[PDB]
Amino acid sequence: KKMSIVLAPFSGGQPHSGVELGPDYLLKQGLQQDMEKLGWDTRLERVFDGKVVEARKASDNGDRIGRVKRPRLTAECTEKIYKCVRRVAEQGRFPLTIGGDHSIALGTVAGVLSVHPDAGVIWVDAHADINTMSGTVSGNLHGCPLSILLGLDRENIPECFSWVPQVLKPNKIAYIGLRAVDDEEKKILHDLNIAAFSMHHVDRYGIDKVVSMAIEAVSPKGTEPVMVSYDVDTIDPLYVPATGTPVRGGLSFREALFLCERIAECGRLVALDVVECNPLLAATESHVNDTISVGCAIARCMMGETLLYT
Amino acid sequence: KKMSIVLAPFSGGQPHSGVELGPDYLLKQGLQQDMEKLGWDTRLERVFDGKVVEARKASDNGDRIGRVKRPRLTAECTEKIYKCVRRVAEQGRFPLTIGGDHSIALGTVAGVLSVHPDAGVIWVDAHADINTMSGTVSGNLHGCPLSILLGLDRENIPECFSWVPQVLKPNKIAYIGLRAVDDEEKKILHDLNIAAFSMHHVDRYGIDKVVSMAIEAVSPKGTEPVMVSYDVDTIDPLYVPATGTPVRGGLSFREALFLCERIAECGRLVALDVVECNPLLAATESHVNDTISVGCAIARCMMGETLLYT
């Protein structure tokens, strides 16, 4: 049980400052002590300085390529995370990456799939995060990682992203909790036949059935490695208020944590990302502690914590 | 795809002013643009002036027949809606009626069943709305439409209601979400063997199963037209605060919208009422926007809007 907690305090994939404070905040809640208490030998991995990156972000509006914002900054930071995560996985350690906005998954997924080529990817999110370079309206890259990982709209992806290995195939990615998919993204999922389970399926079949379906969808070869990239805005805002893109009608706190227990239970989780925790985007301090403690909660449940004896 | 959005700004079926503001408020949210965006050719149908009706309502306390309040006013306005809706349906257009209190369903159901005689009726409500003329304690007619439509307690129904056609039979009406049924109403449902699915059934079988059961109950002849009269107080107040008769322990925002998607999915919806939205009965502006946007949301989901590609 060797784990490396990758610190990825990046906010360049979106507009709002504060999300780079996620890593520090989670660690204050005692994320490492919790992992250690779950029997994991943990080591912290710092990939870059959040203050320096923030500084460079807030100032250079010139970093743009069309609607896309901060491709250069984003490309540089996610390559750093990729190299870190790839190394963490080669050393045989479990990489637990804490963001940071979801654009960091560009480096995490590439890093993990580079070592575990047949690893499936469960994207827990209210969003599909698969907008293409020329398709994105907002230009916020945290909503475009999967398009770049799948190499969609190749011809329009910047040179600064040339580093991204092409290891993820559409049949190895499954979504859970979708409810704010852009029209362009709907067409993409349908055309690539991506296994996507929206809140409709959860409402229709119950979370247990959805998680089972999602795991099977990316684990056909019998039983392969599984990676989970967890966007906290999947959870209904009334549970996760402090986030950049909240959408009502999401997972309940119970379903959000139950999903983790089911994944833990299958015993094939090889990596985990917990992203989009933005402490600054909270009304009261109640909103902050509820969101950050949720991040640590999914971490604990994903890493084996159960309600009863085990 | 021809639709007529029937505006029924009536509040005479209950005490609290404000519910007549529903139609306007929904339209401000962009109800028509949403329907148009769903591919519907929409036309607005104004049945009467809400200010004039309100004025006449707030002043004439003399309009009563026992406990029943405003039978004359109610009878005149609902006959107007009936004529409008009956015409809308004869023209082959889908009538989407926005209230207004639930007493308007006296005109909508009569209008629709007049054209689609074998149409089933799904009453989504926390209440049975079937109190008889001599049985009602409050005398508020928005809780008596189904008794008049089924012609119960004939001998005690006013002359001003002589216009109501007898087209709805007990075996063609199904309730979903019941939780505040009056004792008299419990006896009625049991005696007439009305298919009623309370929050107990939803809690017991899950919303998907209940909707399936409700649709089948009124669609025995194989597959007949279906009409839905949707009272927003079916949804738990913590989701729909701005309503006249809130009862805790109701449908979640997710179940409230999932039910719409399932009905849409069956492809036999022929009419829809969205009632009891009272903007004035809101604490903050957060309560208002949450309720009105919910009304538009059920409209969109009922009319085909899905989370994924379709």
Added chain:
Amino acid sequence: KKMSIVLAPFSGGQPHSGVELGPDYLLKQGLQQDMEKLGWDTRLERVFDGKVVEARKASDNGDRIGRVKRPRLTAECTEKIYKCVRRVAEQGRFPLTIGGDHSIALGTVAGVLSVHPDAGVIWVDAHADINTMSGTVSGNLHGCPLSILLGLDRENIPECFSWVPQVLKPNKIAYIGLRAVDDEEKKILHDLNIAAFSMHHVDRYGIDKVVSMAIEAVSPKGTEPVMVSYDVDTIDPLYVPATGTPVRGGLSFREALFLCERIAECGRLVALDVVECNPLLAATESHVNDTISVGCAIARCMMGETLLYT
């Protein structure tokens, strides 16, 4: 239909004052009138004066045996409840005990099992309440009743508890709603193979299935008497705020009441405890009325109240 509403205004099993106000508060809500309205012939049973007991509690910090706090006071009061409940059951009346903290279940369960020796026990709680004398960290006895009832850690249980009959066996107790079990308690449940259904099972199988499983687990001999000891902190705090030990991710108001209807429905309920309602631990008066009215609600549903005709 003969019922005795046992008043047990005790708070010695925990630190916070106010929980002894539960009985009075529930009765103000009209608990007795509700039971009478459900057809029960009710009689109130006062076991001791809450003001006198409170007075004696708040002053004597000397009443301790290790970490355990107020064993003498607790032992004296619960023996009183035991004698009352045992008598109520011998008279052939249904004992409905209103607390008071959960330490009162020491007297209720012993009283009921003394008359109905093969009675099963459903413990609805977020906690296992089975910490041993030498195992409890907090020393609060409201979290140790089941250890004393099962006679665990005999050698370390005070003399003042010598009165407790040994009538409850591990295979006749089932938990529902667990989510804050101490490590020592996890080991105990696992070693004694106690049927425990946590929020994981509710999330996994749905409340209906859990209640069915829980009833069967203690009713093997075909169909024996069933007793329910209901801790209101089983319900998610956002529904039951005014309680001493709230834990997020609990039962919804709907599941909390549905469980009661299912138990009522089986027709074998022989006793009921509604505990841990602490009116003083409420932010607004909204928190108070929501919690106390919940207590009366579970009472009504447990005693036969249904949403539809019955």
